Every structure is written in C-alpha cells, then in structure tokens.
C-alpha cells in the first residue's frame, strides 16, 4: 500500500 | 486543481510521439497520474499510471509501446511506434489516493489531446437506453474478479466531445458538486448506477471503472459504457 508504489 | 494537455498531432505510421500533461495547483510528488485513451466513437480504455515515487504500471495491451515519465509539474506519454490503432483522444487524470486510503478513482481530468495517425474486464449493460424525463435509469457493471478493497468501482459521465466527469467513487460515494439524483450501489463484482428522476442534462455516456489488484491483473479497467438518451 499504496499498491501503486510497489512493483 | 486543473490539468493542461498539448495540441492535436497528425502523424505518419511508425513515428514516435510524446503527449504532455501539465498540472496546475498540486505537485506530482504527492499525486499519481494516469493516462486513458478513447478512439473516435468508442469508449474509455486505461493505458497506465505513475505513482508518487515514480513507479509505472501499464495495461497488458500497452506494455512496452507506451512509456510514462514525469517531472514535478508535468507527466508525459511517449508512444514508441504509432499505428492506426493509436488514433485516439488521450486524457491524463489525477489518481485519487493518499497515504491512508485509496479511493480508486480519477477525479481531475485534462481536456484531452487528439492523435490522428494516418485478466480483468467490466461488462456494462445496457449499451444504450432511452428515458423519459423524470424516469429511472439503472446501469449495471459486472466484474470478472473482485475489485481492490472490494468496492473501488467508480462511475463517470461524458457528454459528447467533453472529457469524463467523476460522479460516484467507492461504489456509492457521490463526488463533489454531483446532484443527489445519482446514486450507486453494489459489492464484490456487481455494481449499479441509478438515476432517480432523469433530466435532459443527464444525456451522456456513462462509464464504470474498477481498480483491481496490480499483481494479478491490470490495475484499472473501464466498462464499454452506456449511452443514455433523454426523451422530452
Ligand atoms: Cl514529439
């Protein structure tokens, strides 16, 4: 979280 | 509070091209940006997004043929190679999340920039509907997989030739300045948009949009949209 900030 | 986009570009097949989205009244340091395209006469389709720290995510169709980069005030979309299938209006939009919660939605939209070159699905029904003024309109959105947080389904309105406008987010939350005659419901993989007392100004196309889990699917997708006509 935020799931966008991790690949 | 506002996004600005570059002009319309008439290009040859096979030639690289960069679209710009300029941001007024916030920093991309604290905001994620997403790109969405729409070919003429057709519906919204998600391309990808850039996180606050700068991590990119693409739809599966788009991976490799689009690159999203940014500075603090501007985000870009490089089209590596341009085909006829890239003929579309490309919108940028602010991605609605912060450090505490993730609303899933896109709440500020650019005016779009036309480009003429010359799994997770949302099934949205019906494809079109006609309503008497004062009538009731239901639109259904059906996921193929549960959405991020179970409920990050948003609805947008789009009048012809105008950008999309956010109405409902997290399934049932009415956006700023949206009339209460709109309301949304559902959970899991079934959601409905209702218009109770439809008005001549409600004539538009409505898209549902769902946030999924990035590590099992495209991070977002849209329904195919519903054309709503109002008979008066
Ligand atoms: Cl260029």
Residue numbers in the entry:
A (entry chain C): 4 to 10
B (entry chain A): 1 to 118, 135 to 248
What does the original paper state about this entry?
In this study, we produced and characterized two rabbit monoclonal antibodies that recognize a monophosphorylated Akt peptide. We generated four clones with high selectivity against the phosphorylation on 473-Ser of the Akt peptide (RPHFPQF[pS]YSAS) through rabbit immunization followed by phage display and the subsequent ELISA assays. To better understand the underlying binding mechanisms that confer higher affinity and selectivity, we determined the crystal structures of two scFv (A4 and C7) and a Fab (C7) in complex with the phosphorylated antigen. In summary, the static crystal structures demonstrated that both antibodies, A4 and C7, possess a basic residue (Arg) and a few uncharged polar residues (Ser and Thr) to recognize the phosphate group of the peptide antigens, which is reminiscent of non-antibody proteins that recognize a phosphorylated amino acid.
Specifically, the antibody A4 exhibited the highest binding affinity of 3.34 nM toward the phosphorylated antigen and 1.12 μM affinity toward the non-phosphorylated antigen, which corresponds to a selectivity difference of approximately 300 times between the phosphorylated and non-phosphorylated peptides. Another clone, C7, displayed the highest selectivity toward the phosphorylated antigen with a binding affinity of 26.9 nM, whereas no measurable binding to the non-phosphorylated antigen was observed. Compared to the A4 complex, the crystal structure of the C7 scFv–peptide complex is of lower quality (2.8 Å resolution), with only six out of the 12 peptide residues visible, including the phosphorylated Ser residue. This suggests that both N-terminal and C-terminal residues of the peptide are highly flexible even after antibody binding, and they contribute less to the antibody–antigen interaction. In the crystal structure of antibody C7, the phosphate group formed hydrogen bonds directly with four residues: H-S52, H-R53, H-S54, and H-Y97. All of these were also observed in simulations to interact with the phosphate atom for almost 100% of the simulation time. Interestingly, although both antibodies exhibited these interactions, antibody C7, which shows much higher selectivity, maintained the bidentate interaction for nearly 100% of the simulation time. In stark contrast, C7, which demonstrates much higher selectivity (i.e., it binds to the phosphorylated antigen but does not bind to the non-phosphorylated antigen), forms bidentate hydrogen bonds with the phosphate group via an Arg residue. This bidentate bond is thought to be one of the strongest interactions between residues and is a reason that the rotation of the phosphate group is particularly suppressed by antibody C7, which uses only four residues that always form six or more hydrogen bonds with the phosphate group.
